[PDB]
Amino acid sequence: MTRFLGPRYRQLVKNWIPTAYTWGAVGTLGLAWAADWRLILDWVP
Amino acid sequence: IWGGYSIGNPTLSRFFTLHFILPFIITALTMVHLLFLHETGSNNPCGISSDSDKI
């Protein structure tokens, strides 16, 4: 591409990072809850 | 997928149910395929636009 190297794109990515890792948390916990994945669920009190 | 410890009677009925149902999914997806095609029209051997000589 080579187009998307520059200041605006860096700023724009920083704007969306938090939402990204929050959706990541949602997906991970959901997968674990759905497949009764003991590797993660054994650590939940 | 076997339904048991090995290939056996429970697997053959699965093969047969799936072989029965798939062709019709193929039919539906063929209709979608042509729907997509008719929005643009057919390419041709020369690779240049044919809108001056459509029949």
Binding site: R3, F4, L5, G6, P7, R8, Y9 | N44, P45, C46, G47, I48, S49, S50, S52, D53
Partner: protein, 104 residues
């Protein structure tokens, strides 16, 4: 230096092998119409536009009839006209400028 004559030699060979000249077509006729090419075609003056359209229809008719022009009428490598290149270069410059604005 000689290297120019040598490169032009292979280029002429490749041109005759391609064979769009047998159909009476110029090189700039044979481009695929992406976005930039369509915008360059929009910018042509009327005479060039009409000449292009007829040339293309004629090639299509010949292809329909599995035939080619007489050898006397083939497009020759040494007297061809790249009529579309200038307009295309301007279109591409404009798009590049806009991209470059978009990253600041």
């Amino acid at each position: 230096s000689a290297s120019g004559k040598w490169l032009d030699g292979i280029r002429k060979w490749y041109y005759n092998a391609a064979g769009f000249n047998k159909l009476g077509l110029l090189r700039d006729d044979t481009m695929y119409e992406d976005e930039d090419v369509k915008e360059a075609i929009r910018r042509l003056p009327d005479n060039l536009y009409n000449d292009r359209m007829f040339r293309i229809k004629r090639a299509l008719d010949l292809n329909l009839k599995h035939q080619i022009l007489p050898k006397e009428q083939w497009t020759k490598y040494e007297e061809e006209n790249f009529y579309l290149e200038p307009y295309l270069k301007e279109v591409i410059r404009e798009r590049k400028e806009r991209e470059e604005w978009a990253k600041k």
